[PDB]
Amino acid sequence: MQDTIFLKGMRFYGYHGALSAENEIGQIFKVDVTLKVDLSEAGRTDNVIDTVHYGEVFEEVKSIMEGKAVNLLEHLAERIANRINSQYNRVMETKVRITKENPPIPGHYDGVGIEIVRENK
Amino acid sequence: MQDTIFLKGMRFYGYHGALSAENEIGQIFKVDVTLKVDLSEAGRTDNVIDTVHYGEVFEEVKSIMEGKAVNLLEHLAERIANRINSQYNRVMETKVRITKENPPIPGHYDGVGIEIVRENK
Amino acid sequence: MQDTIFLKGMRFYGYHGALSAENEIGQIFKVDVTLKVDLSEAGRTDNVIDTVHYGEVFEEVKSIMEGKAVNLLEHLAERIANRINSQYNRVMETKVRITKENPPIPGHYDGVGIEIVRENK
Amino acid sequence: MQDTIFLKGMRFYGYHGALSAENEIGQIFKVDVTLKVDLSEAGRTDNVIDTVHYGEVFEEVKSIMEGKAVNLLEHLAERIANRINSQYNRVMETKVRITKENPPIPGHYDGVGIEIVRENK
Amino acid sequence: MQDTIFLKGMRFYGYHGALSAENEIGQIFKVDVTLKVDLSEAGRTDNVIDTVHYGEVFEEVKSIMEGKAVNLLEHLAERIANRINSQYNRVMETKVRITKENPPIPGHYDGVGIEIVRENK
Amino acid sequence: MQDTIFLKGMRFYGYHGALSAENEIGQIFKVDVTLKVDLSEAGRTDNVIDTVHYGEVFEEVKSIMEGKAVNLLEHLAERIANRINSQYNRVMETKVRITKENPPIPGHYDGVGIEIVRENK
Amino acid sequence: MQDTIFLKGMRFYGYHGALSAENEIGQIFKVDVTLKVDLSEAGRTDNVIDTVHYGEVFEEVKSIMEGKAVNLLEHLAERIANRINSQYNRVMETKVRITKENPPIPGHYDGVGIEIVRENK
Amino acid sequence: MQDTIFLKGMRFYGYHGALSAENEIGQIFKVDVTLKVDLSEAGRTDNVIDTVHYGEVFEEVKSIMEGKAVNLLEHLAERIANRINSQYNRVMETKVRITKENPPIPGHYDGVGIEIVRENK
């Protein structure tokens, strides 16, 4: 089953980071969420109730990304995957990618970050 | 067998969406279609009749994307995969990705959407 | 005097537009603000008090862009130019460019919008 | 008076070109239209009737770009400027830029084209 | 063994295509070549003779892409894979992706094309 | 008179540069040419003979850019402007911009170069 | 005289900013330098000694951008313009644009900054 | 286990290359590093000590990329993978991709390079 629902390049200004100065200044966090969902029923019915609504997922991601500052991207993604998996039984698995395009790293690069994949129990 | 025929970033202005206001205003839908097709005969012959012509596939996608408004991206992709699989026996499997880069979601992101993979029976 | 202070590509999700459905759904508005300010005193002193702080300008633009929905981009820009000119005497002139990259226009384009230039009286 | 109304990156698939093969195959034409219009009345009133509506301008450009094939970009732009100037008295001047990003020129480049500026008589 | 040598976005102006007018006008062809090669010996030695030189591969691709016009992308890629596999025993497998970003297809898209994967016998 | 004919982002691999190693290795040179030409006759007539054909201009630029290596971008642009001005009396003035996106400069930047403007005598 | 020598998108990781936390963490600063220089002698001679060498200019910009942290972009640009004007008599005027693409501003934008123009006395 | 820590588009100006002239002039090297690391402990704890810090990894990559010039990209990547695997036991496997976007290859392309994957022993 290779069907997926996705939200790409969601950007949020947050205050996460292990560094005091990061928590103070903040920075933009980029998030990609890919959900493993069987979309054949919805494909047949065209009824919004047979799939997972992207809008609701974005709201979840946003509440976590723009909420309380934490140290790690690993913890933020863990919270998001866990939030999506808990509320939607149709989601078989949640992939969360978080990128800091402008972390406190003296250099030239496109971004740094983490990606996790959590199956829905 | 890893050969594929592809059509990337096809853009169509349509009126699909579960929201009345979406159906009224419309928006751009981005579509990626990847077809699993054995291309060694055509690679040998160079005869257009031994492969699936991209132009015809684009026409199919377009007729569905620019036709009657439906609620879901899942239904549109289901219709496209089913259209391509039905008309081309050489297509072993059809992957359809549809992205709403500007849905009615208050936020900053690159796009939201779905992706399905349907084997040709 | 060709010195300027600028804020490029500020994006805000708003509900402006002459169309009911626009006011309901909203869309992203892109804003560029260019301020004609003599920067030689600040260039000499390095004292933040001798120039116009970008951060404060962004806050002004944001309050207008994310506030009450209006019909026209012309009115939004008029309000922004007028806001910046009123609060900063050092600003000799304000240029405001607002772009709707995804208006209710059935077609393929990069964006539509307006640009105004208002001297500070 | 430096106020302007603009439409950027409008893309149309057309058949214009001095070459038979161009007329047969077609290609994408990119168009930028910038209109010199005094926007202070609309800025004050917020009444759509005090400005030139972008949507109507796009429709004009489209009718010309997707209509009968002509040889030159110069002729297409002349027709567009003349169309906009004729129908909108508030437009003091019309700038039309047309780019062929993929003309029949053996080489590597971003685009070729013309730009004209026509005052409204 | 997941090591690879790659050449991305190689662009050539050619005359391939099943349509007479294409053969006459030409267009840009974009090519991506990915080679499965064990790079640990070279990683150890740092001796250019223990790997496949990208420069030579580009020359091969170029000779085929800028040579005689053929009808299909499938045939061009077949010729390239076969050329690379024949001359380099260290290449375990060759992936060739060819994209026509501007084919004779009336529409808005990013590109169309094919991708093949050929193991070296 | 603000009409112009333009050729943007023309790329050529050349061997120009004041450094021996540059002459040996080469690099990509990006060229923008803007020609001041009155386009109203052509706009009226639609006859290709009343304007300057972009294709011929590209050929001129190419012959100079891909010809004998010289030390300076200033000399290459001088030769191009002079070539275009000499052969086309309708060109009132020629602007030539040449950019070395990857010169032998240890750093991170988008490009370096020169731009000249030469009126046709 | 419209000839210019330019350096675009020079990026440096620095510690400038009026905020303590900025000085601590740092961020990327983007710089554009445009120099008004008469390039006809060099265009004629092709002798590197008749123009201003971009490489030397980049070194100057770099020494200032990667040196001691200051509060304002206005002061950094003033120092750069003054450095270039002092060392090169052929430079008739120096334009310096500095952009903070990721300042401590909670929002979504492309960049903020200043631009100055200083004639060489 | 599909969790990863990544650093994308790290750019360094170096002097690597099998060609004398490359070693003399240098060029920009683009590096992508993807690390297979189990991030569930850190996801739970939010303690920076339970994961691999990106900042330290960037420093390692940088020391190798900006250090002594070597002939091959294969050798540079081998050194990086080996450096990361040696210092971090939590890294189960290291993927290193190095791209020369502007090698001494007369042509038009996006980049050439190699990618290796090394499991941590």
Swiss-Prot record, chains A, B, C, D, E, F, G, H:
GO molecular function: dihydroneopterin aldolase activity; isomerase activity
Reaction(s) catalysed by this chain's protein: 7,8-dihydroneopterin = 6-hydroxymethyl-7,8-dihydropterin + glycolaldehyde; 7,8-dihydroneopterin = 7,8-dihydromonapterin
Pathway: Cofactor biosynthesis; tetrahydrofolate biosynthesis; 2-amino-4-hydroxy-6-hydroxymethyl-7,8-dihydropteridine diphosphate from 7,8-dihydroneopterin triphosphate: step 3/4
Residue sites binding substrate per the record: 22, 54, 73-74
Keyword Isomerase: yes
Gene Ontology BP terms: folic acid biosynthetic process; tetrahydrofolate biosynthetic process
Keywords: Folate biosynthesis, Isomerase, Lyase
Active site residues of this protein: 100 (proton donor/acceptor)
Pfam families: FolB (PF02152)
Enzyme Commission number: 4.1.2.25, 5.1.99.8
Repeat found in the keyword field: no
CDD domains the record matches: DHNA_DHNTPE
Variation of activity with pH: Optimum pH is 9.5.
Family statement: Belongs to the DHNA family.
Function of the molecule: Catalyzes the conversion of 7,8-dihydroneopterin to 6-hydroxymethyl-7,8-dihydropterin. Can also catalyze the epimerization of carbon 2' of dihydroneopterin to dihydromonapterin.
Subunit relationships: Homooctamer. Four molecules assemble into a ring, and two rings come together to give a cylinder with a hole of at least 13 a diameter.
UniProt name for this protein: Dihydroneopterin aldolase
